[PDB]
Amino acid sequence: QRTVARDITLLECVGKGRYGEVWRGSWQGENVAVKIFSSRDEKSWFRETELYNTVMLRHENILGFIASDMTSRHSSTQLWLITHYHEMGSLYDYLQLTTLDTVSCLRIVLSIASGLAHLHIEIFGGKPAIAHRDLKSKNILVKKNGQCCIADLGLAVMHRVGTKRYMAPEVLDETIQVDCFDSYKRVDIWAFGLVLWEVARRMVSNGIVEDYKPPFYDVVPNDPSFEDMRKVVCVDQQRPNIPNRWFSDPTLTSLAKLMKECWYQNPSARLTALRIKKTLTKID
């Protein structure tokens, strides 16, 4: 009746971690990304698969799903997640080989806000509300049209822990109301504010730019402990530095105010993804 060409040629490894590996692959002449999970992180494959089995998310700012594959091996299970391939790589990688003008800085952050507001919002008829729970520049891909898309729904919740560098105060101090879905949206908004800070630093104004640095680069070690982060974020209540040079630029002044309204200690005071999108459409 019909042939099912399932052969994906794995061409080069574009990512490796504890989690497993991502490969650039070829299916029918067409690039795909293949995430091969470690046995240690099987739960992230199951959670992303269960989510996509519940709702087939389709959004220009969400990494495009192609397939979940489980293949039986002699004495193990092989778990692959297959998605759209973005040759420009992660925002993390990208911010380290370019600076940004005002148009490209706004296009990036508005696209991430659009992807996040799409996750957060319940649609009837539709989709459940979704919180990401591991938003960071490494989990955002850059597209050729200058918009981004959000990747990695292995920790997502519908209505492993977060990267410690990006954890909100209520996660570090264990006061998060874990039976309140809104609590998880507020944790993503905190993380969003740090990504906004990472991008805004690489936007040029009056001939000046900051070097790419991760959030809290100046106050915590590489691979910060849970304790290291709690002391900075909860006990001392430190926030990322806004450089003086931003206050000469109308875009970076508005973006400083935005990222501040993502970092309130009180989660319920933080802006929503929808309110961030509205603010970004009125900037410039």
Ligand X SMILES: COc1cc(-c2cncc(-c3ccc(C4CCN(C)CC4)cc3)c2C)cc(OC)c1OC
Active-site annotation, residues:
134
**143 closest CA partner among 95, 85, 209:** 85
Q: Helices in 138-239 by DSSP H: which ranges?
A: 169-172, 181-200, 226-230
- Per CB under 8 A, which of residues 64..83 are in contact with a copy of itself? 64-77, 79
Binding mask 24-63 for ligand X (x = CB under 6 A): ---x--x--x-x---------------------------x
The burial of 52, by beta-carbon neighbours within 10 Å (0-12 exposed, 13-18 middle, 19 or more buried), is given as middle
161 is in an annotated binding site: no
Least distance CB 23 / a copy of itself (angstroms): 8
Count of residues touching a copy of itself (by CB under 8 A): 41
What is the maximum alpha-carbon separation in the chain?
A: 67
174: left (phi over 0), alpha (psi -120 to 50) or beta: left
Q: Which of a copy of itself, ligand X, none does residue 15 bind (CB under 5 to 8 Å by kind)?
A: ligand X
Binding status of residue 81 toward ligand X by CB under 6 A: yes
Structure token pair of residue 250 = 């109308």
Q: Which helix (H) or strand (E) holds 130?
A: strand 130-131
Binding mask 211-240 for ligand X (x = CB under 6 A): ------------------------------
Binding status of residue 96 toward ligand X by CB under 6 A: no
Q: What is the Cα 77 distance to its own chain's centre? A: 28
Residue from 1, 72, 75, 266 touching ligand X (CB under 6 A): that is: 72
The DSSP output letter for 63 is P
Applying CB under 8 A, the residues found at the interface with a copy of itself are 1-12, 23, 25, 42-43, 45-46, 49-50, 52-56, 58, 64-77, 79
